[PDB]
Ligand binder design. Structure first.
Ligand SMILES: c1ccc(-n2nnc(-c3ccccc3OCc3ccco3)n2)cc1
Ligand SMILES: c1ccc(-n2nnc(-c3ccccc3OCc3ccco3)n2)cc1
Lengths: 235, 240, 229, 235
């Protein structure tokens, strides 16, 4: 009725598995034409099979977000064949890590903005990292990137707002993915002891939110980091 | 028999302060997602108006009189609601020195009501509590103080209540409106508007519906791993 | 001796953190009025002041009760003078937090008449130290917000309002918790130790100082790196 | 009583003017041996004159924080002559991304460098100074760097804490500096109408806080960003 993204071309990066794939399908299912990407050809192929499998119009694709060449090429390629994407979704020593992420977020976001600017409409949606038990160190990085995301996101939202382009972030919590499904029994129950709802979040649950923010309904929402974590907040 | 799947069909929502603007927009948006909807006001004139508006938009439900500050109103209102319609599981709560009294009163009320409706959500092992912030309400620096002060209370309160309740699959979330198209704003000087819109990255006021849509979202089953959160709806203008 | 000729009021100063604040203020030349909820307490405070050469007075005060507050201040004023450094350090989560802030309000309101005349003041609010996680965060949220609001409402009159947020502090309650739950918890504090009460005091003392006069509405976290929300 | 910084060697970057200089003197005044730096020889010479002038033992110095060579050289130079600095103070503050990215890398570079020394001594202070507010785009950057500082500062505090080294940030507000002191009379009163205390902050007022954090008293304070702004808070 009104959660229709019909006739809108979405771009989901890192969409071969878990959260990213869940975002891809959810966007399609809301009528989006959907371009999922991965770092490899094998990956990009897989994505397409999965789209066709669920009736979603679109295309798998190979993209290295760290490399300008890839980005410039990928977009150019996308534009000609499918159209210009207006819903763009970024999915993916603490210093190096965080520094690299935000530069990428930047690189890509910058690239896609020319297109959103012409159309005077856009959605950028940035996905946080999942919580993962690498100990004391795990707590440091999680918080560090989550801090970067929040800040970054809000800044970029301020810089584009005049052109009716929202920018928002989603901060997953302890999510049921391939990564989590094989962590030690201890670090699981310890961590569930910290989540008020007492379960992991399913990828779909992230997707749904992503889908929301994409919608026209959530058009006065910009610069915001929606926490999806069943109540476990870390700061 | 009716027997639905993807939206709020067969769920009884309660929206407080639903006669005007933001609250009414929430009421309709819930109805439109199939909710059976109980809007309330502080007066009979108000409660009657709400019902007219529901019928007008085909929404099943009832206008109702409720004083959130007074325990017995609350106890009575819920009791009434339960028997006739059912138990609500989606419940939606809608110059400086003032700031303490204002904020104190709100949270006590938020508490009172929330407590009341929880007995029901607990039996059903499912719920949604959704708390609406105040709108940016004056200019001045005093406006800045109160706005921030309630927005701070809401954020904190919301998150706390989410923590004491989460076991029972009941989300608690808040929505923080920005500068929203209202009576207050509709009659301001031609300067203080554009100055203020120079403050909002998106360059416009938020329509009530825009708040509603988010409310509606959080209500949905999709947004079931979202709890204790305060979603800012403000077109980019952030204040503390 | 940098708060010389300034009359400080420290609530809940018989033990641990509050007492540490009391002494630290005295030591910076403050005339110091410590309070407790009982006569036995108030007596003790005075002994301790004398013991450390600090001019001032122990006193009985129920912060929840307007009568006490109005009376206590009146009493203080006549005998010692008007306090301009005032330091608040005296299911369940809502009641708890609600009560605290109302008290913070009550008292703060009371002492402001005095600071306003003098066009100078310090209000310093001290934070508390599964369910434990909920309340800790809940009051800490209230304190931060409350503090900042009140700072906005008084600023014109050169009165700072600030908060201090203790972490895991070495006090009576903590010093005897199980050997396991200590090391587990120290594994969460980056600095690897508990905070001594004095460490809070030193900050309190700082904020009191004229140096920290452009610092208002702020909540200084004293927690050795362990941050929680 | 007695609580100063005697026998401790402090390093203040960008200490020729305003806030940085105020920090330099305040540290000296608390007995610190003090090494102020600037980007030029003219600057570095001036700093020394000012130290002598106020009886403070130490040295002016030339340092480009963006360039590894400078940093490695400067520290080496400092160490053999004066000693190893254990109080280190970083003073500094479309294009919001580049700006903030550059700052934090620098904060990183230097902080890393000086940590070898603090680690040997099992004691340290790192103190990071935020940028001053200037009165739209100003709002974006101010918030953006203030966000980076807060986050960065915390993270680094988490990574060094075991070694009894605090890391803290100070967030100046609208401060009376040469930069601010020549803005229009209108935009002054308008802005003071936004600061609860109704005045600008003097550099010294920052310094005093810096001095505090340096002290042994503020040793259980780490990862924190102390706001010095007379009540005007922005995000
Ligand atoms: C002024 C400024 C902030 C606040 N609060 N910020 N957070 C809270 C709060 C957080 C969790 C649970 C309850 C809370 O409010 C208790 C309260 C205190 C005064 C009135 O209501 N209160 C209250 C008054
Ligand atoms: C570690 C911890 C926090 C952060 N940041 N927190 N916020 C930001 C940030 C916010 C808005 C714009 C840019 C930001 O950082 C860019 C960056 C981070 C690292 C390298 O370059 N970064 C960076 C590294």
């Amino acid at each position: 009725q009104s959660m229709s993204l019909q006739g809108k071309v979405a771009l989901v990066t890192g969409a071969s598995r878990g959260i990213g794939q869940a975002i891809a399908l959810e966007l399609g299912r809301l009528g989006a034409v959907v371009i999922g990407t991965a770092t490899s050809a094998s990956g990009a192929e897989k994505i397409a099979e999965t789209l066709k499998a669920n009736g979603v119009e679109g295309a798998g694709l190979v993209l290295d977000v760290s490399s300008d060449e890839s980005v410039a090429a990928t977009l150019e390629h996308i534009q000609q064949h499918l159209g210009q994407p207006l819903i763009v979704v970024n999915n993916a020593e603490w210093f190096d890590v965080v520094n690299t992420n935000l530069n990428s977020l930047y690189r890509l976001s910058k690239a896609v903005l020319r297109g959103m600017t012409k159309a005077r409409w856009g959605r950028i949606i940035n996905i946080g990292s999942v919580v993962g038990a690498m100990g004391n160190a795990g707590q440091t990085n999680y918080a560090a990137a989550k801090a970067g995301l929040e800040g970054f996101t809000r800044a970029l939202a301020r810089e584009v707002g005049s052109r009716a382009i929202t920018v928002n972030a989603v901060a997953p919590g302890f999510i049921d993915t391939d990564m989590t499904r094989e962590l030690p029994e201890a670090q699981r129950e310890a961590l569930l002891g910290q989540i008020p709802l007492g379960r992991l979040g399913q990828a779909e649950e992230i997707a749904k939110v992503v889908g929301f923010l994409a919608s026209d309904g959530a058009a006065y929402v910009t610069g915001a980091t929606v926490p999806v974590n069943g109540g476990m907040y870390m700061s």
